[PDB]
Amino acid sequence: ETGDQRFGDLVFRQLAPNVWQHTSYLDMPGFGAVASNGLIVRDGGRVLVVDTAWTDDQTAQILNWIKQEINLPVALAVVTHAHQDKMGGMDALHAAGIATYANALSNQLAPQEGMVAAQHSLTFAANGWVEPATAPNFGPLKVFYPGPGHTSDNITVGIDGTDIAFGGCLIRDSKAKSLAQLGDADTEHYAASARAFGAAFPKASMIVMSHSAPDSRAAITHTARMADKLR
Amino acid sequence: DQRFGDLVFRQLAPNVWQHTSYLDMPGFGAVASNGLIVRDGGRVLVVDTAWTDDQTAQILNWIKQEINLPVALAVVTHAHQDKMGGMDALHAAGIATYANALSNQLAPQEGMVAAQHSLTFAANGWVEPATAPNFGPLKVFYPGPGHTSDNITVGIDGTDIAFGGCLIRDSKAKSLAQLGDADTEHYAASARAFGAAFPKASMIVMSHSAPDSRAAITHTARMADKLR
Amino acid sequence: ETGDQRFGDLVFRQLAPNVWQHTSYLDMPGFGAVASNGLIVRDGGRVLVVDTAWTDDQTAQILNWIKQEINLPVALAVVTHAHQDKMGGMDALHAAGIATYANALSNQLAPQEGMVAAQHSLTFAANGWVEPATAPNFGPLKVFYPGPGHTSDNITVGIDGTDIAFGGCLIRDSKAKSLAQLGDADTEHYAASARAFGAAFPKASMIVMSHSAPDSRAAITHTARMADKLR
Ligand SMILES: [Cl-]
Ligand code: NA
Ligand SMILES: [Zn+2]
Ligand SMILES: [Zn+2]
Ligand SMILES: [Zn+2]
Ligand SMILES: [Zn+2]
Ligand SMILES: [Zn+2]
Ligand SMILES: [Zn+2]
């Protein structure tokens, strides 16, 4: 697609002057290639990454692309929950010397899920905002825990200076037929958590998510309505 | 057993009592919920409120009569009415209250009053000590999502007792009785993590069964395997 | 039965001058009491116990019966696998200061079974006989691991100087209609393990077992034949 950059088996799409979406694919029975999206953010003289690819090899390719297209050191990465599409490439981040951050709950779940925990645990205030001492020097990344939904540990990220907020796997596109939630979903609170994401980033007009192309805020209201059906 | 008003108290160890309160739940009838009272030197520690403020005040008045030591702090194990229904009674009495940060985030949505203090947890599940000041023998462990996303558990140092709250059901239970806020994927691992956090505990106290052996942990984990 | 002795919820039957069988019961609602048998052995001025009762309180009843009726200290207990009927009372032994022994695998399985591990681990040679250094001062107790059957960890015990051998839950009543084997039974090897128990204690004429009264060697051959029907 126009605006998409193929790089090995990954796809990169510039979303804003300092923001790109990375996309990697995992082959799954019945579906073929399943895409997962993350973000790359240029912040002055460094790069920040949100979410790995499905695998270490793919995540190394993200770092390779950053070297080629941006040529600035990757300072830190934040992963948004303990599923393979978000934390599958933690090893490649650590081998590159990148400081990694995740919800403390994500780090506690990672071993059970067969993932590597991030090096640092984020903790959150009772109002959902990250405790700033657990997320030092995050630059424009505003990390918000909306409550359980897609998973108990899912977190979300707004990018200061842009119209962009990343709902991860919590938010689905405005035309999604289902939420694709599984047994680790909290179907009682999912709707309120989706709405709390909307409220935490009320001005964001481009909503980026893991398994759909970027959408309008209609993705948030649609997701919450579909989640209403689950309660 | 001992009675103050509508509350029942059962001594479990020299310094530990179980408190039991009841609420009529549409269909089920009178549902019991258990919490703990711990005497620790010159003070008393409470785990979980009763279903209501009035019932929780009854706990506080039994403590004053039978123990006659001030209640230093209370910890609540998740944002459901049987564990946090009586928060206002604790705050009216000047008691410092603690809950998982996530429990305090959920409390408004659940129609609960939030605790005054938020507990946070290391990646290994043990509470960050700075967030649980002066908990004495209370060893607070977050086992992972199960009954709810926010459920926490507590062992009593120097006793055989560990409190699984609503995560653990007794060895004769037929089901977990979990709802939409349960995590059926991780429930079994969380039950097993609770057992591993308090591996020497021989009396397992829980919210909706009388105290049981470690068979309650194993049975709960086996039932949880069947929801995965 | 004639000659049996009651203490609380337990029944004791003298089998030989220096050997008693202890029987405890577990209430299975709608099914009645499930009996489990173990052994008590007088060896000079000390007593040796094979298997606990189902619970700590029942096992304390065993210890009190020993004190009252034999009045010799219990030096050690050996438990024959990690099921409630054999290890359910470990805490009662430890509280009384009795040294406890089990197959290393039984001790490894105990935590996940909700049991308390024994203090000491037995290990076994390739021929099934216990490594003597791991079973110090066992006196007349001859411990044999016959291979997987009832469980992977089940062990068996002969009593030197008597005609008695204890098959635990591996050997079943010669009138049994089924093995009552569960998910942790090894049905490929069960028959060979029962036969190995018979060959390890070839002169034993009284076969004591966990869930029926003492039998002849027919209990061994019948059990092996029942297991043959499952290979
Ligand atoms: Cl995953
Ligand atoms: Na025990
Ligand atoms: Zn996910
Ligand atoms: Zn996803
Ligand atoms: Zn609950
Ligand atoms: Zn409950
Ligand atoms: Zn058995
Ligand atoms: Zn048995």
Numbering used by the authors:
A (entry chain D), C (entry chain A): 34 to 104, 107 to 130, 132 to 151, 160 to 183, 186 to 208, 215 to 266, 296 to 312
B (entry chain C): 37 to 104, 107 to 130, 132 to 151, 160 to 183, 186 to 208, 215 to 266, 296 to 312
Quoted from the paper:
Further combining the substitutions resulted in a triple mutant, K224R/G232A/N233Q, which is as active as the wild-type enzyme in hydrolyzing AMP but exhibits a 600-fold reduction in kcat/KM for IMP hydrolysis. In order to understand the basis for its altered substrate specificity, the structure of the triple mutant was determined by X-ray crystallography to 1.75 Å resolution with four molecules in the asymmetric unit. A water molecule or hydroxide ion was found between the two zinc ions in each chain. The main chain conformation of the triple mutant is drastically altered between Ala232 and Asp236. This has the effect of placing the side chain of Leu234 of the mutant in the position of Asn233 in wild-type and the side chain of Gln233 of the mutant in the position of Leu234 in wild-type. As Asn233 in wild-type NDM-1 is predicted to form a hydrogen bond with the carboxylate group of the reaction intermediate of β-lactams, this interaction would be abolished in the K224R/G232A/N233Q mutant, with the Asn233 hydrogen-bonding group replaced by the Leu234 hydrophobic group. In addition, the methyl group of Ala232 in the mutant protein protrudes toward the active site, which may cause steric clash with β-lactams with bulky R2 groups such as cephalosporins and carbapenems.
As a broad spectrum and readily transferable MBL, NDM-1 confers resistance to nearly all β-lactam antibiotics in a wide range of Gram-negative pathogens. NDM-1 has broad specificity with kcat/KM values of 106–107 M−1 s−1 for hydrolysis of penicillins, cephalosporins, and carbapenems. Other than the ligands for the active site Zn ions, the active site of NDM-1 is composed largely of hydrophobic residues. Lys224 and Asn233 are the only residues that make polar interactions with the antibiotic substrate.
